[PDB]
């Protein structure tokens, strides 16, 4: 019966809560209180990449840390050479409402999608030198919110239909489908080894998925509202989530529990994007007040602020070598900080 | 300096030239509209009327006085809209179509409109309100089988506005009911409007051919008021 099953679910939730309470022998804050802070972090706008006509919704760094793909809701993908500010490509999208973009680790392809429910793959190295739509992955019944390449052939996408999916670009079919989220999945983050990935969704829940087995291994809760952003710790054993309740939180996969919370009483706007520095000591988060707070990931102290965006900060990424931070915004400008 | 650097700069210049070409046509000379409505609404008929001028989003392109309008209708999306509706924070106007003849869902339509109006990211977007299904509303009012005041008790006290211009053949009851619905929407419109955006009600039907001209005129008025406010003339 339904009542018996829900009572069993309540009992199991109590079991899990008690089990993870037994593991809370200490807190990261009181373990890190003895180490000196990083200090007052300062970053200046080295480059300001302009050329987009409308709000930028997403950006991604190439593995070389030079090239940079950004998606704007004017219907354009632009590949930037961040060193020289020169444009490398300008791909006209078939749908204006792009909500995400990705750069292949090899750099041969870029992907993007949005309200059209389709992930389009663009071949950047066509023999004729013109970008062509290599594939158009369809099957999701809701807007695409995130997408990340595992390699030149596989891509993982999260959609507003509450499901994530693993695709084979060559065949264009959904190799695996990930279900369990109750609301829209808003962000996605592959682990460094790409054996695992975490997805943040509405319902204030984050889940850990194993791509080969295709099932949810752990569910992380603690946020009070929608989770808009998620990023893996460089170690790969933890991740940080930004939420609409104006709070970031750090979770450890093995502890199966929230470690630290990054919030201040004077901050009440939601968080749109989060990222870690190369060492993982700094947690950079974008906010709806078009600022970015640099958080001491171990101390939960605001190490600094990145200001200069006129409108909402929507995307935020750190290079693979950790040399610079790129932040996009609804004012249509990208800025490289260092 | 080098040949490769010069080639890269030249390619960037060509890209910038194409971007300059794009920034005028289909970027700045065209106006984007978001079309909203419920299942019972007739927004499909609105799209069909505007046309003469397996998932995702639907776009309709039409022209009035050589001005280019792109009207977007969401297709295969879930029932939760607090996330994907942020994408339309810069459209010139929102077309909101309502089934005025369905009393049972008028409150649902009103809550939809109120949420749209009071959203933080739609805080500057004017709403063009189409009170669709006027003929059905007239038939329902004339029949008298459905007691409209049972859904909205205030209707038992509401009196038709003095400036309410009726149709030549409109029954007084039809005028009272339609204007009561319009004022129910306008109360929400005005109770929270800081002058940054406005609501433009229209009575429409499935056979009506003036909807494109209505949208053109309302977008003109919206942008005119925006410019007047910008220059401290309003």
């Amino acid at each position, epitope marked *: 019966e339904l009542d018996q099953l829900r009572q069993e679910a309540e009992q199991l939730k109590n079991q899990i809560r008690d089990a993870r309470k037994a593991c809370a022998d200490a807190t990261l804050s009181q373990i890190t209180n003895n180490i000196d802070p990083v200090g007052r972090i300062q970053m200046r706008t080295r480059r300001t990449l302009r050329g987009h006509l409308a709000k930028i919704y997403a950006m991604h760094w190439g593995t070389d840390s030079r090239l940079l793909v950004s998606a704007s809701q004017d219907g354009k993908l632009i590949i930037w050479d961040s060193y020289t500010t020169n444009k490398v490509h300008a791909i006209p999208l078939r749908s204006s409402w792009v909500m995400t973009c990705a750069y292949a680790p090899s750099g041969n392809y870029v992907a993007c999608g949005g309200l059209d429910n389709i992930c389009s793959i663009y071949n950047l190295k066509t023999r004729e030198g013109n970008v062509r739509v290599s594939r158009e992955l369809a099957g999701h019944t809701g807007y695409l919110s995130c997408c990340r390449f595992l390699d030149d052939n596989q891509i993982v996408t999260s959609s507003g239909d509450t499901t994530c999916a693993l695709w084979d670009i060559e065949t264009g079919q959904q190799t695996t489908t990930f279900t369990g989220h109750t609301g829209d999945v808003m962000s996605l983050s592959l682990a460094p080894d790409t054996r695992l990935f975490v997805s943040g969704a509405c319902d204030a829940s984050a889940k850990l998925w194993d791509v080969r087995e295709g099932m949810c291994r752990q569910t992380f809760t603690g946020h009070e509202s929608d989770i808009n952003a998620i990023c893996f710790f460089p170690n790969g054993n933890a991740f940080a989530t930004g939420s609409d309740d104006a709070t970031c939180r750090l979770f450890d996969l093995r502890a199966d529990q929230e470690l630290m919370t990054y919030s201040h009483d004077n901050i009440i706007c939601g968080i749109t994007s989060v990222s870690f520095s190369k060492s993982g000591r700094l947690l950079l988060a974008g906010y709806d007040d078009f600022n970015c707070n640099v958080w001491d990931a171990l101390k939960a102290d605001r190490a600094g602020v990145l200001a200069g965006h006129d409108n909402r900060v929507s995307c935020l990424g750190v290079t693979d070598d950790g040399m610079a931070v790129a932040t996009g915004s609804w004012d249509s400008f990208l800025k490289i900080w260092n | 300096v080098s040949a490769e650097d010069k080639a890269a700069a030249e390619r960037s210049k060509m890209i910038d030239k194409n971007l300059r070409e794009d920034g005028e046509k289909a970027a700045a000379a065209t106006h984007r509209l978001l079309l909203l409505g419920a299942d019972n609404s007739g927004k499909s008929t609105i799209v069909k009327q505007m046309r003469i001028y397996n998932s995702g989003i639907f776009e309709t392109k039409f022209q009035v006085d050589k001005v280019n309008f792109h009207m977007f209708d969401v297709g295969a999306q*879930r*029932d939760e809209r607090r996330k994907w509706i942020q994408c339309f924070n810069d459209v010139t106007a929102i077309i909101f179509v309502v089934d005025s003849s369905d009393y049972n869902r008028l409150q649902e339509a009103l809550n939809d409109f109120k949420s749209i109006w009071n959203n933080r990211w739609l805080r500057t977007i004017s709403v063009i309100l189409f009170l669709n299904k006027q003929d059905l509303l007239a038939e329902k009012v004339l029949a008298g089988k459905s007691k409209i005041e049972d859904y909205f008790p205030e209707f038992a006290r509401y009196t038709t506005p003095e400036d309410a211009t009726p149709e030549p053949g409109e029954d007084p009851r039809v005028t009272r009911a339609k204007y009561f619905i319009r004022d129910e929407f306008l109360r929400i419109s005005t109770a929270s409007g800081d002058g940054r955006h406005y609501c433009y009600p229209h009575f429409t039907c499935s056979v009506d051919t003036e909807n494109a001209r209505r949208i053109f005129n309302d977008c003109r008025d919206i942008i005119q008021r925006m410019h007047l406010r910008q220059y401290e003339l309003l």
Partner: nanobody
Amino acid sequence: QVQLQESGGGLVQPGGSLRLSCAASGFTFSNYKMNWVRQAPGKGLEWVSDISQSGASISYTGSVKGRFTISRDNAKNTLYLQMNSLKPEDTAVYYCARCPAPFTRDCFDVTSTTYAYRGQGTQVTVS
């Protein structure tokens, strides 16, 4: 973990009274609007009432004005719906819906089919 637990309900004669209560936990109860929604048999979810963060501004659906009155107790993190003059058409499952985001004035998806921040629901029947 955000969870909302309604209480109260059961059979009642027409013209009777009920006091529906919701105990909320896992979030700052005072930062959000709170709503009451109901789903009569064979019908979709219907928004019944609403109340602001501090209780200053409240609203009701037309068929409910004058009969129900919504109340909020931020100290106790409890939401109430005093239901007077009940009628047979009030027979429905009553859910308490949390506003999706704090400090916001809009409540977009409270009445959706699978809204995440809704309660489990309590059944109310009027003879």
